[PDB]
Amino acid sequence: APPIMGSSVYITVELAIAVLAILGNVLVCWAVWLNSNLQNVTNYFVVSLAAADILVGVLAIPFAITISTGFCAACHGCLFIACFVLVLAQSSIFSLLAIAIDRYIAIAIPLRYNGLVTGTRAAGIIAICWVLSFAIGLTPMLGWNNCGQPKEGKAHSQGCGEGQVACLFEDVVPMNYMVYFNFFACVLVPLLLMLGVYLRIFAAARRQLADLEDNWETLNDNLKVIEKADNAAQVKDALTKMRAAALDAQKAHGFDILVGQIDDALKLANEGKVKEAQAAAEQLKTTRNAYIQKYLERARSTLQKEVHAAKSAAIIAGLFALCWLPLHIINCFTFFCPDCSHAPLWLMYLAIVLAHTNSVVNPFIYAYRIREFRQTFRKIIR
Ligand SMILES: CC(C)CCC[C@@H](C)[C@H]1CC[C@H]2[C@@H]3CC=C4C[C@@H](O)CC[C@]4(C)[C@H]3CC[C@]12C
Ligand SMILES: CC(C)CCC[C@@H](C)[C@H]1CC[C@H]2[C@@H]3CC=C4C[C@@H](O)CC[C@]4(C)[C@H]3CC[C@]12C
Ligand SMILES: Nc1nc(NCCc2ccc(O)cc2)nc2nc(-c3ccco3)nn12
Ligand SMILES: CCCCCCCC/C=C\CCCCCCCC(=O)O
Ligand SMILES: CCCCCCCC/C=C\CCCCCCCC(=O)O
Ligand code: NA
């Protein structure tokens, strides 16, 4: 029975999570500071997220331990301790959203990316995100709370003084706030937007790669049309497709060799010289094996690197959802099913631990998925 025993377990697990969350995320921040190849806008959002995770370990976890005792407290002081973690969760959602959008600009408008997405603007965005996060997570302190209807028997039983409550999460934070405002509007909607941004990212990477492959089969389909053609009207036709395809590819060092050759051969076809156009078009086979093939596979290789980075970002966002959704779903049962008995305490505490674990996991993702983080991690440790 002794509540101190079950409490001892919950506390030592929370403290273990805290140590890990602080250590791992301190290493992320140190790595970005030391390695100028990690100083890019994407990674300022990683740092902001790492800073939220550090604060989970230093403040949210000590707060959660404190609030699990039900200690007597002025109700608004209780709300701050109860709600501060909602600030950190929101800040995380905003950083994750920013990363998604960053990776989308990078892949869908590489033209204007560096031009549109700068480091001083990113800092301004992060500041605004933290301010909003405070405003959302501390909204119960503006009056959307249960401080005006305190549980007087619980306060008396605990020996609390005048104008104090027993400080327990569900006693002071209204469940309509947690479900409608925090979960549906501030968590769920952003996560679905994120899901939409990632669907768009992977679709765009796919269309771009089909195109590269498409333009490439066209240059080749047409080069066999030319080589087996009989009428001259055909050479013109097939070589005309190579040109257009040659420019899309250029857009999508020595393409001007390729286009110059098509142009040479084109003029021959129009002047009725089929055998010499066919032979001139044959030069196109060399410049392809020396240049055009080169654009192709490096473009393929850069594209795949961006998809890889986007996958890494999506995993981090998926793991956030996974760690936090159970608590939100429990709150939905509590709120929407009064006829149901309340989820038991051991499960409440498992869901809280699970959410806190999220703050440990990201450094491992970085280390296993991003070579530059991993290399920087290994150097720091020596
Ligand atoms: C960078 C840091 C060290 C700056 C200084 C932080 C100080 C002001 C903080 C850290 C710990 C805090 C204390 C933590 C707990 C309590 C108990 C509460 O019933 C009254 C406030 C009181 C006594 C706090 C007062 C402010 C405090 C002393
Ligand atoms: C944020 C950094 C710089 C400092 C550490 C946070 C400090 C300010 C936090 C940590 C714990 C908090 C306290 C927790 C409990 C109580 C008792 C309640 O009856 C009034 C509010 C009061 C006194 C809180 C005031 C703010 C507090 C002291
Ligand atoms: N419902 C809930 N409870 C708690 N803590 C108190 C757990 C509890 C619940 C009932 C009870 O009688 C005694 C203790 N922390 C909580 N944090 C959250 C939360 C954060 C983000 C989403 O939900 N929900 N939440
Ligand atoms: C480098 C230090 C990192 C760890 C810092 C942890 C500091 C935790 C700060 C506050 C914990 C909350 C304690 C509140 C106790 C209230 C007790 C009371 O109301 O009488
Ligand atoms: C991050 C800054 C850390 C600075 C050190 C802060 C140290 C204070 C930590 C915990 C204090 C909580 C003690 C609560 C005692 C109240 C119980 C009581 O006496 O009735
Ligand atoms: Na987080």
Curated annotation (Swiss-Prot):
Name the domain of life this protein comes from: Eukaryota
Keyword terms of this UniProt record = Cell membrane, Disulfide bond, G-protein coupled receptor, Glycoprotein, Membrane, Receptor, Transducer, Transmembrane, Transmembrane helix, Ubl conjugation
Question: Where is carbohydrate linked to this protein?
Answer: 155
PTM description: Ubiquitinated. Deubiquitinated by USP4; leading to stabilization and expression at the cell surface.
**Which residues are exposed on the Extracellular face of the membrane?**
3-8, 68-78, 145-174, 337-344
GO terms under cellular component: asymmetric synapse; axolemma; dendrite; glutamatergic synapse; intermediate filament; membrane; neuronal cell body; plasma membrane
Question: Transmembrane region positions?
Answer: 9-33, 44-67, 79-101, 122-144, 175-199, 313-336, 345-368
Q: Give the disulfide map.
A: 72-160, 75-147, 78-167, 337-340
Which positions carry the signal peptide feature in this UniProt record? none
Q: Where in the cell is it found?
A: Cell membrane
Instruction: Name the residues that bind adenosine.
Output: 170, 331, 355-356
**In terms of one coarse class, where is the protein primarily found?**
membrane
Q: How does it sit in the membrane?
A: Multi-pass membrane protein
Q: What GO biological process terms are annotated to this protein in UniProt? A: adenylate cyclase-activating G protein-coupled receptor signaling pathway; adenylate cyclase-modulating G protein-coupled receptor signaling pathway; apoptotic process; apoptotic signaling pathway; astrocyte activation; blood circulation; blood coagulation; cell-cell signaling
Instruction: State the Gene Ontology terms under molecular function.
Output: alpha-actinin binding; calmodulin binding; enzyme binding; G protein-coupled adenosine receptor activity; identical protein binding; lipid binding; protein-containing complex binding; type 5 metabotropic glutamate receptor binding
Residue ranges, Cytoplasmic side: 34-43, 102-121, 200-312
- Assembly and interaction partners: Interacts (via cytoplasmic C-terminal domain) with USP4; the interaction is direct. May interact with DRD4. Interacts with NECAB2. Interacts (via cytoplasmic C-terminal domain) with GAS2L2; interaction enhances receptor-mediated adenylyl cyclase activity.
What does the UniProt record say this protein does?
Receptor for adenosine. The activity of this receptor is mediated by G proteins which activate adenylyl cyclase.
Can you tell me which family this protein belongs to? Belongs to the G-protein coupled receptor 1 family.
Entry text on domains: The cytoplasmic C-terminal domain is necessary for targeting the non-ubiquitinated form of this protein to the cell surface.
- Report the protein name in the record: Adenosine receptor A2a
According to its UniProt entry, this protein's organism is Homo sapiens
